[PDB]
Amino acid sequence: QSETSV
Amino acid sequence: GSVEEIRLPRAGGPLGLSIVGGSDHQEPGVFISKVLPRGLAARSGLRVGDRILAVNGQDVRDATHQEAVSALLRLELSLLVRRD
Fold first, then answer.
1. Where would I find the beta strands (DSSP E) of B1-84?
2. Residue in B14, B20, B72 nearest the CB of A3
3. A positions 1-6 inside 8 Å of B (CB)
4. Where does the PDZ domain lie (chain B)?
5. Domain count along chain B
6. What is the separation of C-alpha B71 from the centre of its chain, rounded to a whole number of angstroms?
7. Residue (of A6, B71, A3) closest to B33 by Cα position
């Protein structure tokens, strides 16, 4: 699991 | 719920949003987990909990996390999202 900020 | 297109200008700054989920990461889909309060995504109408359906016309409903990341980074950015 991950959260990717862009 | 409801489906909206949200168009953002590609002006060279961050989009100001974060995503979670993906077809590799129960409730299926790629979701907006954070919208930075004064960033471009917030100003443009994006909201936490929105599901990203399409990025510049490209279907990401069943995309992996990394597939959705790549589509977002790829002149304007069109995000088809579902909410509610």
1. 2-9, 17-21, 30-35, 51-55, 58-59, 76-83
2. B20
3. 1-6
4. 5-84
5. 1
6. 10
7. A3
Instruction: Name the experiment that determined this structure.
Output: X-ray
The C-alpha of A3 sits at a distance from chain B's nearest C-alpha, in angstroms, of 5
Whichever domain contains B58, its CATH number is 2.30.42.10
User: In whole angstroms, what is the distance from residue B11 CA to residue A4 CA?
Assistant: 20
Q: B14 and A3: CB-CB below 8 Å?
A: no
By Cβ distance, the residue of A1, A3, A6 closest to B73 is: A6
B14 with A6: Cβ contact below 8 A: yes
**Alpha carbon distance B70, B1 (integer Å):** 26
Tokens 């987990």, residue? B33
What is the structure's resolution, reported in angstroms to one decimal?
2.0
Q: Name the amino acid, one letter, at B9.
A: P
